[PDB]
């Protein structure tokens, strides 16, 4: 209902955890579990590539279509570009529907 492609078996969840490394155990044995651990974190890179299948426009329309454009008028910033403080901001939501087909 929100949008997208419903699937019985969507792409699976990737769960990640950094394994616990405990601090020094006491010398005398204790039944209880170890609640003292080393403060720790991890870092890396993810690559996600998707292969998409396209359906090309076959339209026999005469007059020109509507398209999505960046309006030319001058502005303090560039849309879909970084700020002066280094902040990336998307100005407006972009739908998928511009080209037309016959009903």
């Amino acid at each position: 209902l929100m949008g997208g492609f419903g699937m019985k078996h969507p792409p699976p969840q990737i769960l990640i955890k950094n394994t616990p490394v405990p601090a020094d155990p006491p010398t005398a044995f204790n039944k209880d579990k170890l609640n003292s651990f080393i403060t720790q974190y991890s870092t890396g890179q993810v690559s996600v590539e998707i292969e998409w299948e396209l359906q090309k426009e076959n339209s026999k329309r005469w007059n020109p279509e509507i398209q999505y454009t960046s309006n030319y008028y001058k502005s303090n910033n560039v849309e879909f570009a970084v700020n002066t403080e280094g902040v990336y901001s998307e100005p407006r939501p972009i739908g998928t529907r511009y080209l037309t087909r016959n009903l």
Binding site: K60, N63, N102
Partner: protein, 104 residues
């Protein structure tokens, strides 16, 4: 046939070099009128001669004005077959699987 109407009297003569151009739209790239049940059908009785109906379509509008998504289709912009007297046209079509209409 050529028609010349002069002084109210009119003579219908035969043009042997004239053409008629006909195409089938196979890719469904045109507004599909037929399924709307409009007149102009082949007469039910085989001895009748019938006029061919005019083609036309509707597009988006706001009231009577045209909205920017409105489309305009030039029918001359399609490949067609030009036929003189002594030419004939044909094509074949296979219906996709449809459930039997139930007559019971």
């Amino acid at each position: 046939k050529e028609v010349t109407d002069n002084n109210g009297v009119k003579t219908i003569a035969n043009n042997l070099t004239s053409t008629v151009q006909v195409f089938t739209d196979s890719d469904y790239q045109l507004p599909y009128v037929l399924g709307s049940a409009h007149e102009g059908c082949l007469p039910p009785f085989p001895a009748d001669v019938f006029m061919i109906p005019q083609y036309g379509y509707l597009t988006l509008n706001d009231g009577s004005q045209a909205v920017g998504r409105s489309s305009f289709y030039c029918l001359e912009y399609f490949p067609s077959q030009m036929l003189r007297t002594g030419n004939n046209f044909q094509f074949s079509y296979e219906f996709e699987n449809v459930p039997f209409h139930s007559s019971y």
